[PDB]
Design a protein around this ligand. Structure first.
Ligand SMILES: CCCCCCCCCCCCCCCC(=O)O
Ligand SMILES: CCCCCCCCCCCCCCCC(=O)O
Ligand SMILES: CCCCCCCCCCCCCCCC(=O)O
Ligand SMILES: CCCCCCCCCCCCCC(=O)O
Ligand SMILES: CCCCCCCCCCCCCC(=O)O
Ligand SMILES: CCCCCCCCCCCCCC(=O)O
Lengths: 251, 238, 59, 280, 280, 60, 59, 280, 238, 59
């Protein structure tokens, strides 16, 4: 059967028994930087198994009135194991990712989720002009919630769901690497993201490589059951990570 | 020197010309190239990707996300219509802003076939059959399921496979059609009807939703670039 | 140092043009708009395991 | 041999298809995999053999972006009391004009050479006395890479460019033009930048951080008429040898700022009477 | 070999003919068959041998239709109170001018490339005070394929073409010119269309249904003189690489509508005193 | 560059000239050709067809 | 990439000209007005059975 | 064979380096020898293998000095009461304009061909009555090698050059241009000359002694308008085929004389709070 | 004659063009060439020569020559900073006017590694050890010797060899950096600390000085010529 | 009498241009800015005895 999948990174394993295929970025698998594309001269460090492993990113509740959530990477892993330490101690970083989203429900539930990775998901403020701090869209592994109505608080991002916070139609996010979780036939989505950027390496604190979004297109529904909510969990594993520029701990 | 004479068109500035010009930064060393993932070489590659179609434009949608899901109910008359729409990918409000309509709106002519993919998002225990039909251009759109079944159609059975594809063939008198479609270049209608009806067991929701995806086939093509009418400004941005 | 290449013509009906470069910088050349290669698999088929159209998508 | 003669695709044809009755189900698929179905009309109905001569020549990114588009216009006067109003000073960017901005922002990263064309026109300002005789005017366009000196007045010393490129153009001739190579420090231009300037996530945010392309200055060389004359310059950009990566959906909301993504929420699309309405 | 050197008919000669006395009757025929007789003078009288060097070179359709002809002219002013009178907007068609219209309508279907030339002239409007000094004017010609945005005023945003082709031309130079390929959706242009727009035989009737070629817009770029100035533009078309099918008789009645065949009945020809009158 | 000098007739517009000019729609794909019946290549072909002559012009 | 062909001259009295294409679109070429083939049979002899001029038209 | 087809460096790559423990000490050296250390990062830390495609193409002296720079501008009037104010007379030198002067004085000796371009513009002087009609003006540029006759007025006989090269230029055309070979009596131009003119160490001192390049004169050919008109000429120099010897440090102090090295003492550089201050 | 048509850019004067032009002195005989010593063919050759860096800019220097020498004392706390500076070769006042900064100020982009050479000019009987460290860009410059030693550094032992070389590696996210450096293209800091302390015998001066030399490595390069902002005039020189 | 030579292009991606001289004086030619040879030893290593980087500078 092709509905069973198993993934082994480092000292951690993921098993799914009811799943769809695996989506691989833009057809490219993560890989190390080549000698003819590098620019930095000093030797890189490659922790390997110490950093390339699955980390569980806390959990959230799916209610009948949920609208959606987003996470920004690699900020979401900024304080997670030795990956966070290497991020803190090094000037430059580079790594691909494997994203696994778990959501399971009985045969009598219904609903559909879109899981999509958006590279360079620049977002606009709630009030045109003005400005917002780096806390309205990234504060660690905590998830940020979209809003059904138009946002009004000037201190946070425009969370109107139907625009995805980017000024574009929410229905066109299918162009990015994505997968659907349909409770009829699916329990988990798996996406492998290569490193995408305009430069060989970049500082992992200053720049958000990509944003993960989970959006319920068909809202959850059920009847006459004791289960009131459906938890959703996100797991992420860096791949082929390497760092450069050792400079004492700093943001 | 060499005798010459200038012809009409000298000293004109044509925005779509191809001529060589001097370089303002001689012997400039460009940065080495790098193979970033996801290179796109032709806009048809973008046009061939699926995108969700907002079919439920019922003029009283207080929630914008409600546009994407088509309602379905357990008890309905034996023959009933689920939805109906005009096949004007570049002009109809349904397809206007999709990932395909946006690309088409930059061009004047189009041709080729289209794919409509429907996905059932009900409970795993729900079941039903639907008839999806394409009616070529004519003086009257179909009014009942007997009228619809005379055209191109497919019977969709809901089961383990959640999705079915209606491939709209290219039936036209001309090689190309206008994006700003008029009566001369009409393209027809698409309608969906109950085939058997939706049946549910005890302990399940009484309503379900369907979604539609639109994309182009491998014989699709466009022509005659033009400016899109969707974006405009009144003053210089600052 | 003159390149000779075909010029675009319709359907299936001297369809040759000549080009010479005058400047020392490659940036001065004219647009190379005669290339028509394309490959949509990067966006339409990004899955790992190959899927056969005639076979069921799952199982 | 002096001539190098060694230097077309067509869409897929339609194959004849007959009646079928088998276990294969090309029409049934699963979108949950993220896979777009590759079915063709030949797989769901009987079709005739058709030869297609259509080509996708005009859809290439090279042709799509290979059109000159206006990016900036401004006015400057030959003589006036305000010193700042006798010359222009524009920080180069592509976000000023909406149409070309939207065309570019369909991709995340771009790499191309540039062809720049300048269109300059002049007109006499209205007044109570207009009778004068003035010879043909001449204009100078100066490009100052970042960090270079900037002129503060029409007759400053900075206009004596020894290393900054410049063009002198006389009215009545063809518009000025030039070519520019790929002048980015990175491996590609970035239309979007989801990041900050300072390492502690503070300061400027967005595309504004990576815009360091320089300035353009324009003046009348020595024209100073007894009566004011106003000139307008228009700048046109034309990408060449283009390459693009990571397509993204076209924008839906109207633009409101030249250096920000800020917007106002917009409906997904227009409405109709009901889900069955198909008439005009 | 760099040169491709590998890349004339004359009318039929007259053959000598002598006296004849036979059963053959070349002169007698029957027009009822729809057959035009192929007899020659050699078949009905004695003739000498003649070598003809005349050729029908100038009668080919390529040469017949290969002449530039005016198709439209209009005027627009640099400054005025009425906004609509400062620019032109013409829906492209070939029925406006009588001579080229009649030349084209000798055939039912045509297929050709096009060469378009623009002639622009300016003049100062009369008034009580004309003393002014104005630099050379500049003009823009914009082509908008069907469905594109249309400018509503001389300084609208639509004039910033990013994809619509345009030409900027300065007075005193050679006229503007360009080439256009065969841009019909069908396999050939149709001068006549005996049909309706709606499927139930209702709506528009005639050639008007198939005219979807777009529009042309023209303006002064930024010229705005203290005193009004009027400019006139003339458009000339010149078919190239022409092919024609199904010839039809030339029109007899004068034209009366630009988008209809309507006419007034006309006599077949002029009269004379009687059937035997042969004198002047 | 290459020295040159313009001769009489420069910048004139002669309605019967034959010169190359830039294309305003680069790389445009024309519709495939089709052999419609009744192609005419020379006007003499039309001139060689019979037509009824109105000889009886008797002014009444 | 240069074509050499004869130029029109009268009766029976270097009558060669050279042509080069500069643009990438075949629509930019000059008019091809040197072709002189013609065939009036389509309009003068549209009948099915061949008619011999010397023989009677009917019977 | 007609074509001579027989007619790129890249910086050094970085080699992989591992841990080391030995008696060699690449880092330790002695500057007292006048020797600049040739160590590379590979010699003091572990490094990866890097391929460098950077080139030093734009740093060559040919490209560094191969830009047109203004060297002189002056004004002359078509008609005036003062005879000396109707024409210009400039002794050629490169010390007038600061930027190109500093660019040149980075080397002690230079040898190059020259390309000279002239930009001329005209404007009407203000006055109580400006209404006139004047045809296009024409200008003459005359070069007089040292020792030749010099004109004393706008209509002198000396302007009838039989051997002095000259250029006649009409307004509205492209700027005038020419090429000049290496015209020094010595084997190279000298920017600096530490010596005297007389053999007993007396007289003129410095670069002024070796400047014997001639003069340039300019006038309106025959234009003499009823009302004054002022014209300005700008001269641009552009070295070609350059060779340089003996580099010297760039100047620090501002220039104060056109024919002397005189200066005012200047601080070495700007100051900061203390030797440890590193913040903004 | 030969038909032709002028394209945009005709009759323009571009200061960086390359065209042939007539000679005003035909058949002029130039003086024979002579091989003068010291030919320079590329400005990087000049940039690769050492020059003294004025590190001691303490805002109260009454004597200009005091800027070049860095003070050192016999008795100091166990860990103490000798000097600190920002690595902005084209913008920082320390490197602004050096032989390398002057060359850089004519260009907009730069890349490659750098050499800093330190020479001890004390008595022959004096001895000591110093730690010289380079800290890549970050949110905070090092404040103590433990913070500094985490980055690239070298321990310098003063002996018969009077000089030591700190080679600053090229660690950057982009191939090139702006000369007018901004926060996006920061380059880091350089600091020097006492490692053991300076010890002297009887009968020697209690203070000593150090000097710094700056130069570029063999992988250095520049790009994008521009006018230098260091020189200006208000009137024509006479 | 036509020279054909390569024109500058970036990194490692018809990159040929043609040049002809029209004037009789070599001073009229265009700038020869394609030469990239350089040698800094004249200014960096002007010493008499060769110094080995790995060996001590003195003794
Ligand atoms: C993603 C947008 C990137 C835009 C990059 C634009 C690069 C072209 C800049 C050209 C500026 C100089 C043009 C005029 C030069 C001159 O007048 O000599
Ligand atoms: C049977 C009549 C058919 C007529 C077909 C005419 C096709 C030519 C249309 C050309 C319109 C555009 C010309 C100007 C374009 C521009 O200004 O760039
Ligand atoms: C170290 C500085 C040396 C400067 C040498 C400059 C040599 C060029 C002199 C050119 C003067 C004549 C130019 C105009 C001639 C003309 O008008 O025909
Ligand atoms: C700056 C180059 C000017 C070239 C002028 C046109 C070409 C003249 C030579 C004829 C063509 C042969 C070219 C070649 O040998 O490759
Ligand atoms: C854009 C093409 C410009 C051609 C310029 C004129 C021809 C120069 C080359 C001499 C003729 C040889 C042409 C060929 O080799 O086919
Ligand atoms: C004053 C020289 C004018 C040259 C005109 C362009 C070249 C025409 C000849 C074609 C190229 C061949 C040159 C050669 O034989 O070396």
């Amino acid at each position: 059967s092709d509905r069973v999948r198993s993934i082994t990174l480092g000292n951690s394993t993921i098993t799914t028994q009811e799943c769809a295929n695996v989506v691989v970025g833009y057809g490219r698998w993560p890989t190390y930087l080549r000698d003819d594309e590098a620019t930095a001269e000093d030797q890189p460090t490659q922790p390997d198994v110490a950093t390339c492993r699955f980390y569980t990113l806390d959990s959230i509740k799916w209610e009948k009135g949920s609208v959606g959530w987003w996470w920004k990477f690699p900020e979401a892993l900024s304080d997670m194991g030795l990956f966070g330490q290497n991020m803190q101690y090094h000037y430059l970083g580079r790594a691909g990712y494997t994203i696994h989203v778990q959501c399971n429900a009985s045969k009598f539930h219904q609903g559909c989720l879109l899981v999509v990775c958006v590279p360079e998901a620049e977002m606009g403020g709630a009030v045109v002009g003005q400005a917002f701090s780096a806390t309205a869209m990234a504060n660690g592994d905590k998830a940020y919630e979209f809003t059904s109505a138009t946002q009004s608080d000037q201190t946070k991002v425009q969370t109107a769901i139907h625009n995805a916070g980017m000024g574009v139609g929410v229905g066109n996010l299918t162009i990015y690497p994505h997968q659907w979780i349909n409770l009829r036939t699916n329990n988990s989505a798996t996406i492998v993201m290569p490193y995408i950027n305009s430069v060989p390496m970049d500082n992992m604190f200053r720049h958000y490589n990509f944003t993960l979004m989970v959006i319920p297109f068909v809202k959850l529904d059920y009847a006459d059951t004791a289960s009131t909510y459906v938890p959703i969990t996100v797991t992420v594993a860096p791949m082929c990570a390497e760092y450069n520029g050792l400079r004492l701990a700093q943001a | 020197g060499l005798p010459t004479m200038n012809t009409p068109g000298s000293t004109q500035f044509l925005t779509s010309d191809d001529f060589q010009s001097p370089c303002a930064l001689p012997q400039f060393d460009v940065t080495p190239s790098m193979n970033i993932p996801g290179e796109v070489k032709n806009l048809m590659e973008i046009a061939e990707v699926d995108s969700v179609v907002p079919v439920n434009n019922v003029q009283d949608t207080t929630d914008q996300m409600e546009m994407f899901r088509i309602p379905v109910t357990i008890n309905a008359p034996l023959q009933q219509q689920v939805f109906g729409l005009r096949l004007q990918p570049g002009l109809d409000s349904v397809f206007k802003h999709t990932l395909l309509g946006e690309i088409l709106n930059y061009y004047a002519h189009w041709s080729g076939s289209m794919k409509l993919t429907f996905v059932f998002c009900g409970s795993a225990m729900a079941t039903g059959k639907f008839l999806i039909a394409y009616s070529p251009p004519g003086a009257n759109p179909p009014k009942t399921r007997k009228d619809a079944m005379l055209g191109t159609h497919i019977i969709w059975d809901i089961g383990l496979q959640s999705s079915c594809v209606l491939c709209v063939p290219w039936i036209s008198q001309t090689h190309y059609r206008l994006v700003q479609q008029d009566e001369y270049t009409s393209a027809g209608y698409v309608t969906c009807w109950y085939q058997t009806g939706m049946i549910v067991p005890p302990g399940t929701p009484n309503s379900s939703s369907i979604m539609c995806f639109a994309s182009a086939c491998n014989d699709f093509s466009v022509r005659m670039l033009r400016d899109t009418p969707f974006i405009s400004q009144d003053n210089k941005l600052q | 140092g003159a390149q000779v290449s075909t010029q675009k013509t319709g359907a299936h009906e001297i369809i040759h043009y000549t080009n010479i470069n005058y400047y020392k910088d490659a940036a001065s050349n004219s647009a190379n708009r005669q290339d028509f290669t394309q490959d949509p698999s990067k966006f339409t088929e990004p899955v790992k395991d190959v899927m056969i159209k005639s076979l069921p998508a799952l199982n | 041999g002096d001539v190098e003669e060694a230097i077309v695709v067509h869409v897929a044809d339609t194959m004849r298809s007959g009646p079928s009755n088998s276990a294969s189900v090309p029409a049934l698929t699963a979108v949950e995999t993220g896979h777009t179905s590759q079915v063709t009309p030949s797989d769901t109905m009987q079709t005739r053999h058709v030869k297609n001569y259509h080509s996708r020549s005009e859809s290439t990114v090279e042709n799509f972006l290979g059109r000159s588009a206006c990016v900036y216009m401004e006015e400057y006067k030959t003589t006036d009391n305000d010193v700042n109003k006798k010359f222009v000073a524009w920080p180069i960017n592509t976000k000023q004009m909406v149409q070309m901005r939207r065309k570019l922002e369909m991709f995340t990263y771009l790499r191309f050479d540039m062809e720049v064309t300048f269109v300059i026109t002049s007109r006499q300002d209205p007044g109570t006395t207009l009778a004068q005789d003035m010879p043909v005017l001449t204009h100078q366009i100066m490009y100052v890479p970042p960090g270079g000196p900037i002129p503060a007045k029409v007759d400053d010393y900075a206009w004596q460019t020894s290393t900054n490129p410049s063009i002198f153009w006389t009215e009545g001739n063809a518009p000025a033009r030039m070519s520019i190579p790929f002048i980015s420090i990175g491996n590609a231009y970035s239309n979007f930048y989801d990041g900050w300037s300072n390492f502690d996530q503070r300061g400027s945010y967005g595309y504004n951080t990576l815009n360091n392309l320089g300035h353009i200055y324009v003046r009348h060389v020595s024209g100073s008429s007894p009566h004011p004359i106003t000139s307008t310059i228009r700048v046109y950009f034309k990408p060449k040898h283009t390459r693009a990566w990571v397509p993204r959906p076209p924008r839906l909301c109207q633009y409101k700022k030249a250096f920000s993504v800020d917007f106002t929420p917009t409906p997904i699309t227009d409405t109709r009477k009901d889900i069955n309405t198909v008439t005009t």
